[PDB]
Amino acid sequence: AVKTLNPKAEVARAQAALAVNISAARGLQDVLRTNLGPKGTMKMLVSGAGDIKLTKDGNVLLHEMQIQHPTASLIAKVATAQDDITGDGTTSNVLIIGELLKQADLYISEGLHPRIITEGFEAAKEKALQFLEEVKVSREMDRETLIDVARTSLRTKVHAELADVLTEAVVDSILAIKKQDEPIDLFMIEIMEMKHKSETDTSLIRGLVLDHGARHPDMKKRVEDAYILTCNVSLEYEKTEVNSGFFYKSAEEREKLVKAERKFIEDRVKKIIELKRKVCGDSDKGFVVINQKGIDPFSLDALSKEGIVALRRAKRRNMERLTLACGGVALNSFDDLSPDCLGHAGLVYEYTLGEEKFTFIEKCNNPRSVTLLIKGPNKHTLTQIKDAVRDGLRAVKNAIDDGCVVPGAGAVEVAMAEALIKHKPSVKGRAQLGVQAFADALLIIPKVLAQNSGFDLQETLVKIQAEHSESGQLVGVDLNTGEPMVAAEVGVWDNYCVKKQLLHSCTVIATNILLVDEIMRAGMSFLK
Amino acid sequence: ITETKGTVLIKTAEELMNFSKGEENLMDAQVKAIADTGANVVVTGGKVADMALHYANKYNIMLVRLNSKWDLRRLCKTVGATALPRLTPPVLEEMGHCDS
Amino acid sequence: AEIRVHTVEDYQAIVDAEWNILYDKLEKIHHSGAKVVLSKLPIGDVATQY
Amino acid sequence: ALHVPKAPGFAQMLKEGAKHFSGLEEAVYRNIQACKELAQTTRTAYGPNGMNKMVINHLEKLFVTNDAATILRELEVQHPAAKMIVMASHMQEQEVGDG
Amino acid sequence: PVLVLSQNTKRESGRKVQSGNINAAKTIADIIRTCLGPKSMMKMLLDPMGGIVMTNDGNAILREIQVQHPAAKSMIEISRTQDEEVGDGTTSVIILAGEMLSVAEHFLEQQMHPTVVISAYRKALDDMISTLKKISIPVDISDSDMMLNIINSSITTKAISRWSSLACNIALDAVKMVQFEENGRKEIDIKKYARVEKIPGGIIEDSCVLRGVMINKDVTHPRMRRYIKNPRIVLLDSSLEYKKGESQTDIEITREEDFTRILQMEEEYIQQLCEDIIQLKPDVVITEKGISDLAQHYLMRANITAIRRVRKTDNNRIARACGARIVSRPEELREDDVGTGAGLLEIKKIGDEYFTFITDCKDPKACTILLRGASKEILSEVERNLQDAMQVCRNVLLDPQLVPGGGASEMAVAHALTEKSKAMTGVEQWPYRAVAQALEVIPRTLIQNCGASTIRLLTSLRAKHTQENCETWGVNGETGTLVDMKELGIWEPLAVKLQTYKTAVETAVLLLRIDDIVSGHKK
Amino acid sequence: DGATILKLLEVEHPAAKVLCELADLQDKEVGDGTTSVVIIAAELLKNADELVKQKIHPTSVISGYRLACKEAVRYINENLIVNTDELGRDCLINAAKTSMSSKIIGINGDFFANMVVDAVLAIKYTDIRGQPRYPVNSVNILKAHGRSQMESMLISGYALNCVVGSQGMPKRIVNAKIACLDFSLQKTKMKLGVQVVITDPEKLDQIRQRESDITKERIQKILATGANVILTTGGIDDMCLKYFVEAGAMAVRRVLKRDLKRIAKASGATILSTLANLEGEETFEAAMLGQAEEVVQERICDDELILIKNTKARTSASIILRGANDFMCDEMERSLHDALCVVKRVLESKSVVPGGGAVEAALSIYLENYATSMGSREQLAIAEFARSL
Amino acid sequence: MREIVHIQAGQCGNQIGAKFWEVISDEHGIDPTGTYHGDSDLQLDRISVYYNEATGGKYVPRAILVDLEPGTMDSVRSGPFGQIFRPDNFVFGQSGAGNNWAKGHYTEGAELVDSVLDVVRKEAESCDCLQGFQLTHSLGGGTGSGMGTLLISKIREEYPDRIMNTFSVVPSPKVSDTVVEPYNATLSVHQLVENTDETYCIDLHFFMTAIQELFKRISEQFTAMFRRKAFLHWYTGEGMDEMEFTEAESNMNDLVSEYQQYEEAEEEA
Ligand SMILES: Nc1ncnc2c1ncn2[C@@H]1O[C@H](COP(=O)(O)OP(=O)(O)O)[C@@H](O)[C@H]1O
Ligand SMILES: Nc1ncnc2c1ncn2[C@@H]1O[C@H](COP(=O)(O)OP(=O)(O)O)[C@@H](O)[C@H]1O
Ligand SMILES: [Mg+2]
Ligand SMILES: [Mg+2]
Ligand SMILES: [Mg+2]
Ligand SMILES: [Mg+2]
């Protein structure tokens, strides 16, 4: 049809349209199945520029492998829409869709309409969600519980000597900035990375770290007690909005105009100096000025004669981290200066690392915006750690915002598999084939874990399914012996919202794919 | 000179004759003010002027130019001086003492 | 520089002011007893005929 | 004659010019070979009896040096596995300075 | 030498063109006919940018295809004429036009002039309209459970039908809010005030209709509040900063204090503007322009919240939901233009992004539709289906008439014309029954798409309509049997049917009046 | 139609371009018969070749052709029908419907014929009582795809292809006072030769305030007389759109000058390009406004438009065409223009002749027996004119 | 002394910007390795307005190179005088707009722009005092125009009292190199009206007739395109609306009016 109207068209009719979507779905899963569990292998990614990126997370991998397909673009966008909401479950998303399309093809190839399978997915999706509500366990979410949840999501993206160090820095940071009410607000934990020393020196600083210091060589480098003045006023020489211009005379009137144009900016400096001299009469306290706008070299010479350590051009986000930490007020004008608008720190010292300068704010009274300091000897090591830190922070915020936690280790995928079998006869018609095919796709998480540890794929499932019929215990798969182990009494925990979103997402995409009739490309070759 | 675009405005013949002499006599006092403090060597980091060079030689002063910014700061530590952002005579703590 | 004159009487005095600035420099040289003068910057023809 | 086609899956969806090296005989055993060649170039300049090296970069500038780090800096390397060994050496120069 | 007369102009004529125009129209119908009925399958496209457009809509498919034949270009344009007029029926208008244009070549090959066929087509179109208005059944607007059945029968074909209990209450509660009467007796339902926001993530069951407007913005200063109970919002259009004029102004200064005196007036100008706003006691300030840093200092002193750089269209819907009017000069500020129709203002985070919510309104006349789902491709098809559900609802209020669907209407008019053609005489009788028998393609595609014998079900339906009262008997599109439409509950507005029959006849008339093509003349 | 096919074709033979420019002359002088005249002109040359290829001098053919053309016009005036003897309203429907055949709207002639006649009689201009004048291209023909071609409506007033400026203004005014303007309502500014030089910083705020105050006073002078609708050919600043909001008035910007001329004429308003008067001040009297009876902004197929109905000063017409797509509507406009020019000529020149080939068949008889009284070589030329018709 | 910085965006902006640095490095005698081997004093009194010095005598420029395609970055890096740029000043994407002004403005331009403001801050921190910005972009391609329009809007907001000059390019007079060139140009000019101080066009503050010809031809094609509503669903579907395009043509008509050049019924009045 279309080939008669547009000769330069590419079409795929009848079952050639289903053979392209199935083939590519299984192609992305044979590469993404080696990343599952703490026993997955690391991958090397090299771009055209020549940089090196070692990643294990399914979202970073999918957006870095050179892949040009229409139907491989739909799965890529589903994983992105999970990383920015839940932050976990990007590898398990591709595996289930790739396998759910594989099982549904065994019945379509036997002369069966794809719509009959579709009705089976809807019934199986409603039973699976009603089964998950009774498996979750509601707890208080004390410190000891959040250690176990955070460790499960950090032991798969680093080694054991690092996850034990990064777990304490993530659990502590969330607790320090959480109030008794209101949702946990992110964007208040600055992630600073310095390329020095080893990777085991990644610590948590109760304060703020700024990537710039003082620009005068006559300013203090260590203050033991200081008032923090956070301001967003301009101390640079500025010009009138309307076009002006001096019109002077004999050379004496030129000198009367050069120092008459600096009065407006030297008045702002003289308001700070009197405020400093009032609250600090004796040379025993400091006075640190943090600005969001620039400062002239002239104003860095007036402030440095009184020991006013001043920093210029801070980021806009730090006008909110510095009020929660210290306790001042971030003001825009100087017409209402008062001692009530000043912060308080306990130690401000400067750190110089080669050609870059860092400033530390420590010993705050009641800090509410902590910072994380990342250290590592390689550029790609600081990116590998920064991915795990993001993963571990969204695994703790999810565990607090939802008062329930689901056990892991694959002990829950086996549980929907047994529940849906006894629900198969209750569905009338040929739609029982949808429920049987759905119960087979959910069993890929135990299969991949059993296969990545070096066991038998079939002999392990029969052992896991030998339990859970004779004892109502959520038994998972061990990753060192292959024996059935109970996941609720060891420490393996997942998130209730991660598993809930995954079931919702993996069914909607694989239902629209199975109903695609043809792949038509009749438009313009390129927008030109 | 001012950073804003400024210009002179001569409206009488009498102000036109005195303008050139006014600028020169103004510069004599500025250079002589520094020369009275004993500053034998003046080190700058900008552009030297033709009229300013004349008065430097008159009072037996040494003028050295270093247009490298950080190289200037290293000299301040060697002699124990301070960089003046303005053309004003130093008072007591901004005078570096060398030996040769 | 810029000159903003209002009346023609001040117009003629300006033209005589530039010819008096130059002649003031040349007279100061001649009074000093010099006989040979050298200069990096150019010497105009009016000074050559002086 | 006949031609061997491309295996279905990931190999059929790769962009042109890209390469894929997976396995133990294709990725691990080849990475060791690249790094073993790098050790035989800088070994001659070890100890008091070391020898100098004439290196010319792409600006036609000549370097006669015996430092190990300086030789690696003026040599371009296009092997990813050999590039980590270089960045491991450049980190000791900024911490210690010797070694 | 090389002389020409028409500069390489390609001319074709004769009967070759007429058979070329009909075969170009039938090909367009052959692409779309598999996307009609509740058993329809799905297609994907490939736009020149790189995206994917996967849909069932008849206009969203033909508008992406580039075809060089002039006769095919007319069938692409009538698809969007239906789309912009009634919203629904972009597929039935293409299949019907092809069948009405295929049955014409049978008469053109029998030495019949094309002008004879034109008079038969236009004569029969005046009998289709009179028959449809005879079987029309009125609807009651105040009945709410009936307005849910009309929308449900229109989205039972798209990919939303799994959640038909949810999208029925979304597209109904939005049209009823927009309806509004400002001056005189002019009643308008404008869908420019029904903003649809798509956010990837969550689940489709979280899609709701807020009682106000949702903006993607944040507070300028962190010290400002983020939760106000009963706000008094004032909307602005000018910028709160010092700018330049346009009359070529310059300043000449010759004293020592004239420089700092000029800089001091820029701060007194801002204070003058702010004190004209704090006098009216707002709570939130909304502006379409920038706000200076000094102007924010004077607004945190009075506990005022400000939003900078709001779009013109987002700033128009706020005035329709809170109740206010846009003021440019802050000096002409009164009490009648302060918004006191809201009941909440909170700023949340939805996946590492701040959002401004203005909900709990007294009597809003503009709303926003918040969609959540899986990807950007899935949410795109939800928006196309919802825009189909509101355009059906709007048509009912402007014309409360319904007709049976599922194929009962096509046979009802096919029966009426076959019994009226036997009283006429002449050569106009034969093209009069082809136009009536060409309408049986709508209920014939409903049998093929589900899977059934189209040669036994069609003849069991034609003989079914021979009785006097059977005008509502149609074909079930899910099983493949003849059921009455009085119990199934399939209905469609009269405005949709009148536009499908009228557009199709004129496309057939226009393409039956061409006999030569002059290809290539460089404008 | 012959005027549009030949105009769009690229022709470069010099002997063929003469026929192309001939068709363009018929459309301007008369407006109809643009394809009937090309056929006669090309047939006349073909019949003249057979004579010139013989030993007939070309000047004898030209002399005979001028004689036949002269006597063929005198005979037509014998074959004349004066419309006033037959029914006035049956000699215009038939004459307009004949021009409607051979077009897309051929079957719908009995519907479109009434519209064309009712649109010409509405714009009948009054002369000094020597002869009625019926201007054409004064009705506005607007295309908008949508419902069937039987849904086209004749507006008893004027229709504008414009939209209201701001969404806060009303969209329906019952008793409207039209105030047609020809200048932009923006902030004032100084000309090229006038600059502003400030020597005192205190006299700056007052000057800046006076740029937005001059335009404020001008608008207040207009609204004080009771103006309801403001029509401007120029642009209106967004600051000046707020004064019409609380005043309950409509303001339409960027209106064409050809459209404003017809709106002002039909409602009695006066187009003014400035507010000055015979003295130095600026004023705005109330004796120079318009008066309509319903100004409603209707919606037609998504996009909107502004109707102006029941103008009391004069009568005006406008036609809105409804078709299937853009190709169909553009052919209904061209075939409606050809019908408007046919009615105008009948009203102006009160004489019609039978159609359907009854004239050429009658002229080929009279010219055949007329050439028998010449007895020269001009006999052959006249006989060829009879056969060419 | 009022130091200035540069921003280069898009494929066209990088190619011209790479050659712009050529006329300054050689005029001031800056070696390709970053060192200095000049022999004049006039090449050093203004060396700090365009170059930031490093320890040991390295002079690096003050340019930021942004793009939505990583394949246009290595061309400058491996080309002549490409080694002197700061390695951290390269900002690249992975998707590309694909001649889409709106994709590079709200849906995908909203992520990379946050990666550019953090870069312009660290450069502006080192300077003593800056007076303005220099940005280079295009008006036909949506990759640069959409990203530049957002970038040029997020620069003015943080620095409302700083001048900013642009060196944009304009489409060809008669021929058109893209189908949707008029769509991508009208939506970008009106955002440069109240956000710029001086603009230049390379083939009331617009420099290079009186530019009246350029704006006349663009609105002729735009009106013909908008009457049929052709290719409009590509922009409205990602977050636009019909009224947004109306304000573009209404504002475009106003600028033409500021650039001024200097029926059969006439019986009674
Ligand atoms: N220590 C462990 N022992 C057994 N199973 C684990 C362990 N840690 C994680 N898992 C399981 O591995 C699965 C996938 O984890 P992972 O691949 O790290 O990230 P993602 O959930 O994004 O795929 C989870 O469902 C979890 O139940
Ligand atoms: N449940 C049903 N059974 C039979 N026919 C149906 C059913 N639902 C819808 N239809 C028919 O589908 C036709 C419309 O199909 P669709 O392609 O969704 O919209 P349109 O073609 O009008 O744009 C209508 O004529 C209607 O009679
Ligand atoms: Mg994980
Ligand atoms: Mg050593
Ligand atoms: Mg439909
Ligand atoms: Mg005619």
What's the rounded Cα separation, in Å, for the pair B48 and B27?
13
How far from A151 is each of A38, A176, A393, G43, CA to CA, in Å? Answer: 11, 19, 11, 60
For residue E142 the two structure tokens come to 């105040």
Closest alpha carbon to A447 in A55, A24, A21, A29? A29
Interface E-G: count of C-beta contacts within 8 A: 29
Sign of CA dihedral A159, A164, A166, A167: positive
> Quick check: do D and B touch, 3+ CB pairs under 8 A?
no
- DSSP element (H, E) containing F297: strand F294-299
**Inter-chain touch F127–G264, beta carbons under 8 Å:** no
G45 contacts in chain B (CB < 8 Å):
46-47, 67
Active site residue A90: yes
**CA proximity to F101, closest of F335, F312, F257, F328:** F335
Residue F196 DSSP one-character state: E
F310: left (phi over 0), alpha (psi -120 to 50) or beta: left
Is the distance from the beta carbon of residue A494 to the nearest atom of ligand 1 less than 6 Å? yes
**For residue F105, is it left (φ>0), alpha (ψ between -120 and 50) or beta?**
alpha
> Comparing C-alpha atoms, which of G263, G188, G261 is closest to residue G218?
G188
- Give contacts of F261 with chain G, Cβ < 8 Å: 263
Classify residue D6 by its DSSP letter: P
DSSP E8: S
Place of tokens 């943090």: A290
Among the listed residues E349, E370, E361, E274, the one whose alpha carbon sits nearest the alpha carbon of residue E318: E361
Contacts of G153 (CB under 8 A, 6+ apart): G191, G195
Question: Would residue E423 be called left, alpha or beta, if left means φ above 0 and alpha means ψ between -120 and 50 degrees?
Answer: alpha
Stretch (H or E) spanning A349 = strand A347-353
Phi/psi of residue E370, each to 5°?
A: -100, 115
φ, ψ for residue E470, nearest 5 deg: -145, 25
D23 among annotated binding-site residues? no
CA–CA gap between residue B91 and residue D87 (Å, rounded): 52
Distances (CA, A) of B99 to B40, B78, B79, B94, B96: 12, 11, 9, 17, 10
Are residues A78 and A93 in contact, defined by beta-carbon separation less than 8 angstroms?
yes
Min Cα distance D66 → chain A (Å) is 24
Q: Which of B2, B18, B82 sits opposite A250 (nearest CB)?
A: B18
Residue G55 touches partner B, C-beta closer than 8 Å: yes
Q: Are strands A347-353 and A222-223 parallel, antiparallel or unpaired?
A: antiparallel
Cα distance between residue E406 and residue F120, in whole Å: 48
CB contact (8 A) between residue B16 and residue C4: no
Q: Do G2 and B69 touch (CB under 8 A)?
A: no
- Pair F230, F245: CB distance under 8 Å: no
Q: Which of A408, A409, A415 is nearest to A465 (CA)?
A: A415
Q: Which two tokens stand for residue A93?
A: 């998303």
Given a contact cutoff of 8 angstroms between Cβ atoms, the answer to whether E493 and E500 are in contact is no
CA distance F321 to F318: 10
* C-alpha D67 to ligand 4 mean position (Å): 8
CB atoms within 10 A of CB F380: 17
In contact, G136 and G6? CB cutoff 8 Å: yes
Structure tokens at G142: 């949506």
Subunit partners of chain F (3 or more CB pairs within 8 A): E, G
- Is E48 in the A-facing interface, judged by CB distances under 8 Å? yes
Cβ contact F140:F158 at 8 Å: yes
Phi first, then psi: what are they for F381, rounded to 5°?
-65, -40
Structure tokens at F11: 């022709």
Rounded to whole angstroms, how far apart are CA atoms F328 and F104?
A: 8
Residue A156 in contact with ligand 1 by CB distance below 6 A: yes
Q: Which residues contact B18 (CB under 8 A, 6 or more apart)?
A: A250
* Spatial distance between the Cα atoms of G135 and A414, rounded to a whole number of angstroms: 59
Chains F and E touching, counted as 3 or more CB pairs less than 8 Å apart: yes
Distance of alpha carbon F204 from alpha carbon A242, whole angstroms? 10
Q: Which atom of ligand 1 is nearest to the CA of A152?
A: 8
* Backbone phi, psi, residue A300, to 5°: -85, -5
How large is the C-alpha radius of gyration of chain C?
Answer: 15
All residues at 6 or more sequence positions from A76 whose CB lies less than 8 Å from its CB, including other chains: A62, A63
CA distances from F146 to E60, E95, F172 (A): 19, 19, 24
Contact indicator for A254, A195 with CB cutoff of 8 Å:
no
Per DSSP, G104 falls in state I
Q: Do B85 and A254 touch (CB under 8 A)?
A: no
What does the alpha-carbon distance between residue D27 and residue E462 come to, in Å, rounded to a whole number?
72
Helix, strand, coil distribution of chain E in percent, nearest 5:
45, 15, 40
The CA-based dihedral angle spanning residues B5, B11, B14, B17, taken in that order and rounded to the nearest 10 degrees: 40
Within 8 A by CB and 6+ apart from E50, the residues are G98
Residue A91 CB less than 6 A away from ligand 1: yes
Write down all domains in chain G, each with its CATH number in brackets: 1-203 (3.40.50.1440), 211-262 (1.10.287.600)
Spatial CB neighbours of B17, under 8 Å, sequence gap ≥ 6: C17, C20, C21
Strands G163-166 and G198-200: parallel
Q: Residue A406's CB: how many other CB atoms inside 10 A?
A: 22
Q: Which residue is listed with tokens 């189908």? A: G179
Structure letter (DSSP) for residue F352: B
* Structure-token match 């044979």, residue found: A30
Rounded Cα gap, residues E334 and A8, in angstroms: 64
Nearest to F346 by CA among F137, F132, F38: F132
Residue F259 a catalytic site member: no
Q: What is the token pair recorded at A444? A: 């890929």
Which chain B residues are Cβ-neighbours of G55 within 8 angstroms? 70
Resolution of the solved structure (Å): 3.3
- Amino acid, single-letter form, for residue B49: A
Q: Which residues of A touch D (CB under 8 A)?
A: 23-24, 26-28, 30-31, 44, 46, 50, 52, 66-69, 72, 196-197, 354, 377-379
Report d(CA F314, CA F301) in Å as an integer: 30
Biggest alpha carbon–alpha carbon distance for chain A:
107
Class assignment of domain F157-348? alpha beta
DSSP labels, D12-40: GSBPTT-----SIIIIIHHHHHHHHHHHH
F244 burial type by CB count under 10 A (0-12 exposed, 13-18 middle, 19+ buried)? buried
Sign of CA dihedral E175, E180, E185, E190: negative
Distance CA G10, CA G66 (A): 7
Atom of ligand 1 nearest to the CA of A156: 18
Distances (CA, A) of E263 to A261, A426, E85, E465, F143: 10, 82, 59, 89, 58
Dihedral pair phi/psi, residue C41, rounded to 5°: -75, 160
Angle (nearest 5°) at CA G33 between G27 and G36: 50
E201 Rama class: left (phi>0) / alpha (psi -120 to 50) / beta: left
Report the gap between the CA of F283 and the closest CA in chain G (Å).
Answer: 22
CA pair distance A132, A419, nearest whole angstrom? 11
Would you say E208 and E171 are in contact if contact means Cβ atoms under 8 Å apart? no
Distance (Å, whole) CA A390 – CA A186: 11
Tell me the CA distances in angstroms from E491 to A255, E36, E386, F27, one per residue in order: 90, 16, 18, 52
- Mutation pick from A322, A332, A502 vs chain E, by most beta carbons of E within 10 Å, is A332
Instruction: Please spell the DSSP secondary structure of A9-72, one letter per residue.
Output: -B---TTHHHHHHHHHHHHHHHHHGGG-STT---EEEE-SS--EEEE--HHHHHTTS-B--SHH
What is the distance of C-alpha G77 from the center of its chain? 21
- G142 known ligand binder: yes
Distance of CA E226 to the CA centre of its chain: 36
Which of A5, A85, A186 is the closest to E72 by Cβ? A5
Helix or strand holding residue D62 (H, E): strand D62-65
Residue count of chain F, please give it.
389
Contact E521 F9 (CB under 8 A): yes
Ligand 1 atom at shortest distance from the alpha carbon of A57: 22
User: With contact defined as beta carbons under 8 Å apart, do A491 and A479 qualify?
Assistant: no
Residues in a beta bridge with D62: D56
DSSP 8-class letter at E13: E
* Per-residue CA distances from G205 to G84, G192, G211, G258 (Å): 34, 10, 11, 12
Nearest to G257 among F138, F235, F326 (CB): F235
Answer whether F208's CB lies under 8 Å from F183's CB.
Answer: no
Q: Which string of DSSP letters, residue by residue, matches E150-211?
A: HHHTTSSSSTTGGGHHHHHHHHHHHHHHH-B--STT--B--GGGEEEEEEEBS-GGG-EE-S
Distance in Å, alpha carbon of C3 to nearest chain B alpha carbon: 5
The CA–CA distances, whole Å, from F95 to A88, E409, F110, F117, F321 equal: 81, 42, 12, 10, 22
Q: Is F66 helix (H, G, I), strand (E, B) or coil?
A: helix
Catalytic-labelled residue, pool F27, F232, F233, F338: F338
Could you tell me if the CB of A501 is within 6 A of ligand 1? no
Judging contacts by C-beta atoms under 8 Å, the chain F residues touching residue G267 are: 125, 127, 133
Which strand ranges, in their side-by-side order, compose the sheet holding A203-205?
Answer: A190-194, A371-375, A203-205
- Rounded CA separation E286/E319 (Å): 11
Distance from CA of B97 to the nearest CA of C (A): 37
The structure's method of determination equals: cryo-EM
After which residues does chain C show a gap where C to N exceeds 2.5 Å?
A: none
Q: Give the DSSP letter string of C14-50.
A: HHHHHHHHHHHHHHHHHHTT------SS---HHHHH-
- Indicate the residue of E7, E182, E502 with minimum beta-carbon distance to F10: E7
> Look-up: residue for tokens 């643009």?
F34
Given the structure tokens 């009046």, which residue do they identify? E513
Q: What are phi and psi of E188, to 5 degrees?
A: -125, 140
Q: Does A527 lie at the interface with B, CB-CB under 8 angstroms? A: no
B-chain residues near C20 (CB < 8 A): 17
Please state whether beta strands G130-136 and G63-67 pair in parallel, antiparallel, or not at all (unpaired).
Answer: unpaired
Smallest CA-to-CA distance from G179 within A525, A2, A10 is with A525
Residues making up chain E, counted from first to last = 523
Query: Could you give the CA distance from residue A97 to residue A77 in angstroms, rounded to a whole number?
Result: 13
Taking each helix axis as running N to C, give the angle between helix A379-401 and helix A143-152, from 0 to 180 degrees, rounded to the nearest 10. Answer: 130
How far apart are alpha carbons E321 and E360 in whole angstroms?
10
Q: Residue E275 belongs to a domain with what CATH number?
A: 3.50.7.10
Amino acid (1-letter code) at residue F135: P
Cβ neighbors of A404 (< 8 A, separation 6 or more) are A136, A137, A138, A139, A496
Alpha carbon distance A350, A357 (integer Å): 7
Whether A38 is in the pocket of ligand 1, judged by its Cβ within 6 Å, is yes
Other C-beta atoms within 10 Å of A121: how many? 23
Query: Closest Cα to residue A245, out of F198, F206, E242, E266?
Result: F198
Instruction: List the structure tokens of A477.
Output: 């798969």
Give the number of the atom of ligand 2 that is nearest the alpha carbon of residue E90: 23
What's the sign of the alpha-carbon dihedral E71, E72, E73, E77? positive
Structure tokens, F359: 């004239």
> What is the Cα–Cα distance from A357 to A351, expressed in whole angstroms?
6
Q: Whose CA is nearest to atom 19 of ligand 1?
A: A89
Q: Whose CA is closest to F178, among F257, F288, F307?
A: F288
Q: Which residues of A40-62 are buried (b: 16+ CB within 10 A; e: fewer)?
A: beebebeeeeeebbebbbbbbbb
Q: Report how far apart the first and last C-alpha atoms of chain A are (Å, whole number).
A: 26
CA E179 to chain centre: 17
CB within 8 A of E160, min separation 6: which ones?
E167, E382, E385, E386, E389
Residue C44 burial (C-beta neighbours within 10 Å; 0-12, 13-18, 19+): exposed
Q: Looking at chain A, how many residues does it have?
A: 528
Give the residue among F136, F85, F79, F90 at the shortest CA–CA distance from F113.
F90
Q: How far, in whole angstroms, is CA G225 from its chain's centroid? A: 25
Q: Are G124 and G118 in contact (CB under 8 A)?
A: no
Measured in angstroms, the CA of E84 and the nearest CA of chain F are apart by 6
Question: Across the interface, do D15 and A69 touch by the CB < 8 Å criterion?
Answer: no
Ligand 1 atom with the shortest distance to the CA of A157 = 18
What tokens does G182 get?
């008029």
